[PDB]
Amino acid sequence: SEEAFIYEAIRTPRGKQKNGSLHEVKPLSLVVGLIDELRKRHPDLDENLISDVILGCVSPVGDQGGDIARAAVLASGMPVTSGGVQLNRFCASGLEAVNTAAQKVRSGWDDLVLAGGVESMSRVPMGSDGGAMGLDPATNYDVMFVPQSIGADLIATIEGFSREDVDAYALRSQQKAAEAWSGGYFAKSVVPVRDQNGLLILDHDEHMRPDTTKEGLAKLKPAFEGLAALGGFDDVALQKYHWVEKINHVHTGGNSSGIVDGAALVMIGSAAAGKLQGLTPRARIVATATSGADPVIMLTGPTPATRKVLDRAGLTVDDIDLFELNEAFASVVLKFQKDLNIPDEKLNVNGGAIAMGHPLGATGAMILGTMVDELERRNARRALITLCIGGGMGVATIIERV
Amino acid sequence: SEEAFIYEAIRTPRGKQKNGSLHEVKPLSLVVGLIDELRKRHPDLDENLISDVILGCVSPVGDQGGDIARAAVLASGMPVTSGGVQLNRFCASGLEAVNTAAQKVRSGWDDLVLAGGVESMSRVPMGSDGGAMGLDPATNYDVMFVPQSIGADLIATIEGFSREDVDAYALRSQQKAAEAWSGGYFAKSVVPVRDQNGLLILDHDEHMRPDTTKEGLAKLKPAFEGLAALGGFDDVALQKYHWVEKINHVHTGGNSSGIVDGAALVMIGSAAAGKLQGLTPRARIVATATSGADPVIMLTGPTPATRKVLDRAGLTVDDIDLFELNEAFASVVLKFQKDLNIPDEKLNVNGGAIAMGHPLGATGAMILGTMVDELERRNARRALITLCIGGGMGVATIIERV
Amino acid sequence: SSHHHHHHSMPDNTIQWDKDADGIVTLTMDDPSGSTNVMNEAYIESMGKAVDRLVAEKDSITGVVVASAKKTFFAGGDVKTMIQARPEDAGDVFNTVETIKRQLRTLETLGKPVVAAINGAALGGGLEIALACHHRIAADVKGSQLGLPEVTLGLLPGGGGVTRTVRMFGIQNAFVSVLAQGTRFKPAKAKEIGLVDELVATVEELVPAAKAWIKEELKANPDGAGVQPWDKKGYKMPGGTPSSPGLAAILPSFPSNLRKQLKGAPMPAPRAILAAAVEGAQVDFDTASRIESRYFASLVTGQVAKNMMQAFFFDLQAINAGGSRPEGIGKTPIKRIGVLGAGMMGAGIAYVSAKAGYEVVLKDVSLEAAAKGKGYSEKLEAKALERGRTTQERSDALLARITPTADAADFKGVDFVIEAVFENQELKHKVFGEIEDIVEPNAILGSNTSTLPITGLATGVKRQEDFIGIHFFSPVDKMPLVEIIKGEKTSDEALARVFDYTLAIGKTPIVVNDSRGFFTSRVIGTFVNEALAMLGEGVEPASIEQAGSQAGYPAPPLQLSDELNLELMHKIAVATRKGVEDAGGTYQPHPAEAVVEKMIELGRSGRLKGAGFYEYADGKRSGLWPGLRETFKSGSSQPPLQDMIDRMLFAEALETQKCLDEGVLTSTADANIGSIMGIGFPPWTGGSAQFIVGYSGPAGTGKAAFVARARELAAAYGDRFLPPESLLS
Numbered sequence A, B: 001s002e003e004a005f006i007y008e009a010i011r012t013p014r015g016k017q018k019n020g021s022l023h024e025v026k027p028l029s030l031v032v033g034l035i036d037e038l039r040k041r042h043p044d045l046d047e048n049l050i051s052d053v054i055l056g057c058v059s060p061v062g063d064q065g066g067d068i069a070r071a072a073v074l075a076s077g078m079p080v081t082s083g084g085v086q087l088n089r090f091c092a093s094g095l096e097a098v099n100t101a102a103q104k105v106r107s108g109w110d111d112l113v114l115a116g117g118v119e120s121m122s123r124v125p126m127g128s129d130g131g132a133m134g135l136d137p138a139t140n141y142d143v144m145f146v147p148q149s150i151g152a153d154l155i156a157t158i159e160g161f162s163r164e165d166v167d168a169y170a171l172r173s174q175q176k177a178a179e180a181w182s183g184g185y186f187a188k189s190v191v192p193v194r195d196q197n198g199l200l201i202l203d204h205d206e207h208m209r210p211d212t213t214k215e216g217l218a219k220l221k222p223a224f225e226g227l228a229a230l231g232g233f234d235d236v237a238l239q240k241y242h243w244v245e246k247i248n249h250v251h252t253g254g255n256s257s258g259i260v261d262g263a264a265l266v267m268i269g270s271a272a273a274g275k276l277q278g279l280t281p282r283a284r285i286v287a288t289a290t291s292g293a294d295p296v297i298m299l300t301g302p303t304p305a306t307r308k309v310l311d312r313a314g315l316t317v318d319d320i321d322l323f324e325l326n327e328a329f330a331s332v333v334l335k336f337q338k339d340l341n342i343p344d345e346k347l348n349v350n351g352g353a354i355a356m357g358h359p360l361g362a363t364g365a366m367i368l369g370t371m372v373d374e375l376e377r378r379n380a381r382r383a384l385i386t387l388c389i390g391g392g393m394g395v396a397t398i399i400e401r402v
Numbered sequence C: 001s002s003h004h005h006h007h008h009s010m011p012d013n014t015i016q017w018d019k020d021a022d023g024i025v026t027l028t029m030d031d032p033s034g035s036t037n038v039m040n041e042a043y044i045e046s047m048g049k050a051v052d053r054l055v056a057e058k059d060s061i062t063g064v065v066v067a068s069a070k071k072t073f074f075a076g077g078d079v080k081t082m083i084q085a086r087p088e089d090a091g092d093v094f095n096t097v098e099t100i101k102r103q104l105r106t107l108e109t110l111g112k113p114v115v116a117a118i119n120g121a122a123l124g125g126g127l128e129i130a131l132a133c134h135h136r137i138a139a140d141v142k143g144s145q146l147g148l149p150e151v152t153l154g155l156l157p158g159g160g161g162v163t164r165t166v167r168m169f170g171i172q173n174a175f176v177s178v179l180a181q182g183t184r185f186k187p188a189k190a191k192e193i194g195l196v197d198e199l200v201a202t203v204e205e206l207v208p209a210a211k212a213w214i215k216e217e218l219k220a221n222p223d224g225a226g227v228q229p230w231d232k233k234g235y236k237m238p239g240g241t242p243s244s245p246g247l248a249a250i251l252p253s254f255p256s257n258l259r260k261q262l263k264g265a266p267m268p269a270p271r272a273i274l275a276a277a278v279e280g281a282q283v284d285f286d287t288a289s290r291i292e293s294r295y296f297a298s299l300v301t302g303q304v305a306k307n308m309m310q311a312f313f314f315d316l317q318a319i320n321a322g323g324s325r326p327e328g329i330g331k332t333p334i335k336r337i338g339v340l341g342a343g344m345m346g347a348g349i350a351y352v353s354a355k356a357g358y359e360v361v362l363k364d365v366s367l368e369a370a371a372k373g374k375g376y377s378e379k380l381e382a383k384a385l386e387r388g389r390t391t392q393e394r395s396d397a398l399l400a401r402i403t404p405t406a407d408a409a410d411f412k413g414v415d416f417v418i419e420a421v422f423e424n425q426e427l428k429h430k431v432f433g434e435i436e437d438i439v440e441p442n443a444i445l446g447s448n449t450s451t452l453p454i455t456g457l458a459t460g461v462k463r464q465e466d467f468i469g470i471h472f473f474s475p476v477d478k479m480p481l482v483e484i485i486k487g488e489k490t491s492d493e494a495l496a497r498v499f500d501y502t503l504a505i506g507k508t509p510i511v512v513n514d515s516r517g518f519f520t521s522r523v524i525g526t527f528v529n530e531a532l533a534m535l536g537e538g539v540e541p542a543s544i545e546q547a548g549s550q551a552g553y554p555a556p557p558l559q560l561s562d563e564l565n566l567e568l569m570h571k572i573a574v575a576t577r578k579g580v581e582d583a584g585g586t587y588q589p590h591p592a593e594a595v596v597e598k599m600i601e602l603g604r605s606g607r608l609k610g611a612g613f614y615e616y617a618d619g620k621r622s623g624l625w626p627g628l629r630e631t632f633k634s635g636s637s638q639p640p641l642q643d644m645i646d647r648m649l650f651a652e653a654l655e656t657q658k659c660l661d662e663g664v665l666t667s668t669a670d671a672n673i674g675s676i677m678g679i680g681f682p683p684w685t686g687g688s689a690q691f692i693v694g695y696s697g698p699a700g701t702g703k704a705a706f707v708a709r710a711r712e713l714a715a716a717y718g719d720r721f722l723p724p725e726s727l728l729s
């Protein structure tokens, strides 16, 4: 019935894993900083009409445990009626939180919802929460557990993507990310992180290496070739993909997503919710879709998910102005581009996680807000956001400018 | 827009914390068993039309980490497109999953969703996931963090419930739960847990003490007097509630919800989803709501959440045939009954968590499926399910028989 | 990255460099601008040069010894600089402590042993320097203290004190004593708890023992020499990290317990210390140190730190330096003391006088009562022999100086009199007349009076000059203030002799000119009267007590109004009414008076009768009286809690201003310390006078924001909160 509109979409800068600026910052603080930025833009906003805060978090333990969404509501002084729920759908948790918020608005039983995610990977490393798919031999043996990196190298092996091919995309992401920053595209969306005294901690995406060259990327060594030998994950994958004789490990630290700290926040609401609080809608969420693919590759999820969201919205690839796929690994983006024949000038036009980083729980909301801003800048109509997910899952979303 | 229907709603027996029957059972195995029971009831269901598997889990770490919902999909051999997401809204997680699943179906972007929750509190104790609200002093000092128990004792103090009053409710919970098992009310929905060889592990709620007497409940020691003294939570609460001079610690281990292991699964879908798969609707999600109250007395959440879902469904207290509020603490049910003038014959008619147990992540889905069966057995129309939530939250759902 | 404050574009040198033939470098701290070593801009640049040189000459240096050429090792941060830091200066403050800790971290990671030669006191930044060393040797000299007392000034150990003590002892052990309390330790106790590793007899043994430890360390373990335990790969934090299951189970109770100890008072320093401690224990040492700097900058740029630095450093030093002592007067040693009255006041004066080493004669109206007063000193020594604080040989020599008597002839040879009889001028006239001639000629005649003016009490004796007011506080064994009251015919020589006596018994003195109520009794009356008024207005009694505790008071007002007898408070209300009606005026009663008389009508006049606002069974408080709600219709008035808190704080701060206008007090320092140490004014305010210039609420901060809230309180609760004309413009 009702339509879900995106009124605000902000994010923090991403800080490196080693010697990172945000390493001293609690993950809860990254979210509260964004809540206060929303307050700064709408001081007369009646926060009592905000019925839920939905944050995605892949490692909800330690600093990120105990319903960090509820902690953000209480620590930021938001009304106690504003709820607060943490969810985890691996890499799409940020986008799934926005999707769940949109579906809640459409059902009529929610009016104004804050959605996004947080992930301080330098404070809470990947895998800190555990899980049966890895730490249970019976489940691990059955699902043929293989880390995401091996699946990425397997995709490059099957699709014929060379080490130069993936490094070429890594160079493109670094260059387009640098052009986006120097062009001022991210000025209003990236909210600088400050301390209790107002002192600056981080205002830019630290993981970026804008002076990246083709020769520098070729000197890097395969980062996941030792994880394949110590663990036999290569032999596990080839047991399912028996027609492949050997996995070509092409992914290094220069063509894979960066391990960074970050958080993003989006304000989704109905048209009546925006008119009541005097908010101007920036974009409309057209359709969402959840699908998946084989869990050994576990990175081919975007293709069936994008196909489903295009079908449900009654659209085709030609109807989409911008395509945004999380750059978890270069081969993942190269396969998605080849599968749907995505034009190169439509795909990740402002760089991606290779240059800027991949805060697991927050990435989906970060690239969602990146397309909201680029649609307004380019004055384009539609964009499709999608992420590959661990476990072979896939989530996609189509937004429309307003 | 699109009406959401409950087609199946099953649960496991609740095994106790100390020498419990389910302590040897991994939480993933509890969920898979309920999935296999859904297959036994519908051997020809095309599981490819299942869009998502949402599971509530309050301590998503260790055996319950790494997205146990996705682990349930992959381990049970479900289609790899069936998603899998874990959410955490403390005690509402089981009901919040069903509501989110219902809201997903209403948006039209999902067709058939499995919702529920899992919590093996004997394996993954409460608080194992850490948390900023408790384990970060700056937040624990800004927010007035007081455990759920003191807020329950404070409820009885302000509202004037005596130790005999809360033991009186604990008695009728044990009696009504025992009468429900004797009358065979739970024979259809409680799916016994079995090992990999088909041998029985548990087939009843082994936390029940059906021979409870009013004299035995009075012998028990207030189990939350050492916590509020060794941590000073009594003084922290009374700093916000300054007009209260002393907190009467009336809650013991016999009038509080029990620590148990359990899991629940609800199959929610659209009307077209049931017709295509031959599923017969059992109930319809009329409306859901999320609200809250003061965080220090964090168990006052269900009162404004119930009013909000009644106003949204266009109903009054007299229109509801059955009220189901989780028996987290006896004083929480007494205040809810006192505020809304709930008739005693309509309140938790088959017992509750004091007798059968409170598996944090699954309780919401368990008591929901309880009302689905009770509405049918009584041939009644409407029931209202709600839970009191840590941090001051509250969630309420209204179902109608079909 | 730099070890210096500036990197562009002339301080004094405070470090003396000396490299011996073995390769050991002795850094001797000798600030030529003062009698103590502090962390001013001179020390920062001096230590910057030395650390740069330690790195440049690393190949020819084998060890370092940090020493001091003054009585004290190092006194810590420059309070004169820190008290001026404004919120806009948060960036400069952050960079300074980062530079200070960058120097210590370089000293700490040289790969060579560094020993601290702690000759005298090492407090705050001084101990933080020693904590950066790998070994600490302290001379067991007299007057030497060691600790991190930053919290007592509203700060935190921001030079690595929080970070390193947590690495040494764990979160719980470091916070409980040295951090949250800021307690000062003698060198023998410092060695016991672990802040110091070795002790020597004299200060000359230090540098030799320091150099000998370096030579032995380089031979016993050459791999671990100059490597702190937390810089080794297998480091395990004592008690565990916040991720350890043992500490994580009890960690949620630390802020709530601290919230309980502070009773909800607005003292942000312990909250920040605990946050920096736990947050720091979650990251590496360097990241933890940077977190510590941000919490330090949030305190120094705050207002509570200003108040506490003003009162507990500047105001307290001005008092202990003779600021109230007039001109110059020679000292007169006290040979024997005579206390009049064996009540809880007189018996408390006898205990603190003998515990200082004075002979005391405790007289009363019978030997039966004088022995029950000496039993007040026996019960304290019995509890002090169990805690191990006093020895049996000293506890017996202490009680031997207290001679319980009932005859006035035993006051022969007394050259110091302290009367503590009932509050009756004719009685004080009488009890002084029986003894004025028995005592020695130049004997000081003191009176522990609550309200009765000393000028009128002096006419009961012959020598009007030696008569003086020596106000003690209940209980005397704990309370540290003595309110010296000056009568109209009181000489300046007797003013100093009581000033010296107060310093001899280890107490803090203030000088007050004679008036009814003096300063302490008059102000503390406004505090309790404001609470009784709230009770008569119908405010819940539990909310009144909570508002009193969350304000920072050590005792809630209704509870304090039971310790003070409501019979005594009614006597004062009659005197103020008789004095106005004897001049023809119309006495305007305080709203509390109707509550005092109503409680007396009900026979509940305080703890002495066993019934007051609380119920008293077997000599202990048993909660508030249940009938109190029906009597005053409690619950009918529900004002904001901050409105109640301000009413109690403002009533005292305004009356303190009147005492300054009327000349009762001559210095704000006496007003601040006198209110803090006398009537328990909340320490975070810096005193009842500092509370005016340092008020902070929703209105703002400063004397202007104090008047606005004062006028806001006057418009809602009564014209008594109207600010005096001195506060305006």
Ligand SMILES: CC(C)(COP(=O)(O)OP(=O)(O)OC[C@H]1O[C@@H](n2cnc3c(N)ncnc32)[C@H](O)[C@@H]1OP(=O)(O)O)[C@@H](O)C(=O)NCCC(=O)NCCS
Binding pocket: A018, A091, A148, A149, A174, A209, A212, A213, A216, A217, A220, A223, A252, A253, A254, A255, A256, A257, A258, A259, A328, A329, A358, A360
């Ligand atoms: C790929 C990965 C293993 C790299 O880890 P890392 O070695 O710590 O990464 P760094 O970038 O710090 O170091 C990589 C090396 O290549 C260099 N490098 C990285 N990117 C570069 C670039 N664009 N140009 C030049 N050099 C580059 C680094 O400087 C470093 O050189 P060094 O080893 O001499 O210091 C890690 O980022 C990773 O696992 N990411 C994938 C994400 C993932 O698996 N899961 C998340 C969800 S999909």
Ligand SMILES: CC(C)(COP(=O)(O)OP(=O)(O)OC[C@H]1O[C@@H](n2cnc3c(N)ncnc32)[C@H](O)[C@@H]1OP(=O)(O)O)[C@@H](O)C(=O)NCCC(=O)NCCS
Binding pocket: B126, B148, B149, B174, B209, B212, B213, B216, B217, B220, B223, B252, B253, B254, B255, B256, B257, B258, B259, B328, B358, B360
């Ligand atoms: C209440 C609580 C502290 C009880 O802990 P416990 O001591 O392990 O619980 P038990 O069931 O063993 O109860 C203690 C005693 O009461 C007895 N008892 C409990 N229920 C009884 C009943 N209905 N009749 C008679 N005796 C009963 C037990 O037999 C036991 O006897 P014991 O002392 O010899 O062992 C714990 O269950 C709890 O914290 N639950 C409340 C919920 C909560 O805090 N968080 C969950 C989210 S709200």
Ligand SMILES: CC(C)(COP(=O)(O)OP(=O)(O)OC[C@H]1O[C@@H](n2cnc3c(N)ncnc32)[C@H](O)[C@@H]1OP(=O)(O)O)[C@@H](O)C(=O)NCCC(=O)NCCS
Binding pocket: C034, C035, C036, C038, C071, C072, C075, C076, C077, C078, C079, C080, C121, C123, C124, C125, C126, C149, C150, C153, C317
């Ligand atoms: C150092 C100390 C232990 C003993 O001092 P002392 O030998 O009795 O000498 P005094 O108290 O007379 O002080 C002498 C001088 O030292 C100065 N001084 C002492 N500590 C100082 C400090 N931390 N900052 C600034 N000046 C200080 C005094 O202001 C005085 O200067 P002045 O004589 O020119 O007026 C005592 O001064 C003290 O308690 N210092 C406070 C240390 C502290 O708590 N620091 C906390 C912040 S890190």
Ligand SMILES: CC(C)(COP(=O)(O)OP(=O)(O)OC[C@H]1O[C@@H](n2cnc3c(N)ncnc32)[C@H](O)[C@@H]1OP(=O)(O)O)[C@@H](O)C(=O)NCCC(=O)NCCS
Binding pocket: C168, C169, C172, C173, C174, C176, C177, C178, C189, C192, C193, C194, C195, C238
């Ligand atoms: C705890 C410890 C200091 C003393 O243990 P102990 O000698 O067996 O027994 P006690 O604690 O009864 O010793 C008495 C002293 O301990 C001190 N103490 C106890 N716990 C303390 C703590 N957490 N911090 C500081 N001092 C402490 C007391 O102040 C007391 O001093 P006193 O004798 O003058 O009254 C000792 O175990 C130790 O040296 N290591 C523990 C960790 C540590 O170093 N803590 C000190 C932090 S400064």
Ligand SMILES: Nc1ncnc2c1ncn2[C@@H]1O[C@H](COP(=O)(O)OP(=O)(O)O)[C@@H](O)[C@H]1O
Binding pocket: B243, B294, C540, C543, C635, C638
């Ligand atoms: N601030 C207060 N001061 C005194 N009494 C209060 C206060 N707040 C609530 N009460 C008491 O509680 C009763 C109901 O208050 P209520 O508004 O329900 O409190 P809350 O909103 O905190 O639950 C009132 O009748 C009153 O007697």
